[PDB]
Design a binder for this molecule. Structure first.
Ligand SMILES: Nc1ncnc2c1ncn2[C@@H]1O[C@H](COP(=O)(O)OP(=O)(O)O)[C@@H](O)[C@H]1O
Length: 327
């Protein structure tokens, strides 16, 4: 569907229904995914149009050389990086293949994409290639990847119009943007940056930073768009449990409702579940596992609760108590 690329605000709206926080990154991703697809669409419009007017534009669009906006997502693990990508790829119904930088301590990647788009060369060439942990790399993998990102022919697939998205935590980058970098400091500094600032300084990263980190200028140039995500705070985590369209709590309420039980998570209960996910550093990924751990018993004997109201509390969450069944 290169027929209609929803506006950046529309895309961002979809994003908002699944990703909490990361407002800037959401904005940057939306505009970036839009510009990428507006171009492929616009470009396709002319060709079909097949005439002299639309043919001059095609030449100018080529002459001007509109660099492909491959994206580079930088943010702590579990912040919504591949989620943002997955969310939109599912909305625009675009085939997307996720991979791992470590896999290359190859063409194999484009293979999954084909599998993800029914071997239809066309849809695959309009798809997304997600490279996670681009930060884990060695100096060879990059170049081996660069050929494909830059755009080449592989056997057959043409990777020229494939949107590349690289992601990583770049654990080191934090300090690098706090050594030989602008907005320096003349005063007496008390100690190493707190991960709060060590994650807030990233939002001030420039291309020369990714280099120092160990990224070949050849690849960084291929990632015009840099987007940084924060770490999930307690408040956002609290929102993730209840706000999104597919929020865990609504899943559990949907499931309990089928057996005519009204399931309620008391505020401090949600706060406790969220605070747990952080400690255990199991992140947002670990929310379902924490809920299952104190809900299993409840779901096991749910019938003797039919028609009533089950109220989840902090104690219950901490498994220091039973849930509040209310007639
Ligand atoms: N910002 C977020 N908003 C809502 N859910 C999130 C967010 N970040 C992470 N999650 C949850 O945790 C999982 C980790 O997702 P992901 O973004 O792909 O990780 P990473 O940022 O390391 O690439 C998601 O699939 C989702 O269920």
């Amino acid at each position: 569907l290169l027929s209609y690329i929803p506006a950046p605000k529309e895309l961002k709206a979809v994003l908002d229904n699944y990703v909490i926080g990361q407002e800037q990154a959401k904005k940057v991703f939306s505009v970036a995914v839009y510009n990428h697809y507006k171009r492929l669409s616009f470009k396709e419009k002319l060709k079909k149009q097949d005439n002299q007017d639309s043919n001059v534009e095609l030449e100018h669009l080529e002459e001007v050389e509109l660099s492909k906006s491959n994206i580079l997502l930088i943010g702590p693990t579990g912040s919504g990086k591949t989620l943002m990508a997955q969310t939109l790829a599912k909305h625009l119904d675009i085939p997307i293949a996720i991979s791992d930088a470590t896999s290359l301590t190859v063409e194999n990647i484009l293979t999954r994409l084909l599998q993800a788009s029914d071997w239809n060369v066309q849809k695959a060439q309009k798809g997304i290639v997600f490279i996670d942990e681009i930060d884990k790399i060695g100096e060879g993998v990059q170049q081996a990847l660069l050929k494909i990102v830059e755009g080449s022919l592989v056997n057959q697939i043409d990777t020229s119009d494939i949107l590349f998205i690289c992601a990583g935590a770049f654990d080191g980058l934090a300090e690098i943007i706090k050594k030989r970098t602008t907005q320096n400091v003349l005063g007496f500094t008390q100690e190493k940056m707190s991960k709060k600032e060590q994650e807030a300084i990233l939002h001030l990263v420039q291309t020369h930073d990714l280099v120092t980190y160990g990224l070949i200028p050849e690849l960084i140039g291929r990632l015009p768009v840099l987007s940084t995500l924060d770490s999930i705070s307690l408040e956002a985590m609290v929102d993730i449990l209840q706000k999104p369209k597919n929020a865990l709590i609504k899943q559990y309420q949907q499931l309990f409702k089928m057996d005519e039980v009204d399931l309620i998570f008391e505020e401090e209960a949600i706060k406790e579940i969220a605070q747990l996910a952080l400690e255990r550093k199991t992140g947002a990924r670990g929310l379902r596992a924490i809920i299952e751990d104190f809900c299993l018993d409840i779901m096991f004997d749910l019938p003797k609760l039919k028609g009533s109201e089950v109220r989840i509390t902090k104690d219950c969450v901490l498994k220091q108590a039973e849930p509040l069944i209310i007639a």
